[PDB]
Design a protein around this nucleic acid. Structure first.
Length: 84
DNA sequence: AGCAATTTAAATAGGGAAGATAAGCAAAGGGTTGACGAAAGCC
């Protein structure tokens, strides 16, 4: 079941240095991080955070986690302090 | 048409009252934002 698939379409593509050259790099999301972050920051009540529902109004499209956890995946609120 | 002096000390204490209450309603909308995959005309 666990194999590979490659579609850089719609996928951010950034350069990152290899030390003496560059390496064009595609950042994709982590599945363990998303579901584990939702469960843990809900069960230890972390509230300086966001909520994002992946898929839109039909969350059966993206993944199976999307389809089940339709309440919304939780993202960290990475807002810095503001002066004055 | 500028000159106006210096030190010295500024009150110790005791009191700042409790008893009551601090409304009950009813409202808080849904409308878009669906991709993959499969019939089915169409170059």
């Amino acid at each position: 079941c666990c194999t590979a698939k490659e579609d850089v379409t719609t996928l951010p593509q950034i350069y990152f240095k290899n030390g003496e050259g560059y390496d064009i790099l595609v950042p994709i999301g982590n599945a363990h991080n998303l579901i584990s972050g939702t469960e843990y920051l809900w069960e230890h009540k972390y509230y300086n955070t966001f909520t994002q529902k992946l898929g839109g109004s039909n969350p059966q499209n993206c993944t199976h986690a999307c389809n089940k956890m339709r309440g919304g995946f939780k993202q960290f609120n990475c807002t810095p302090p503001q002066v004055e």
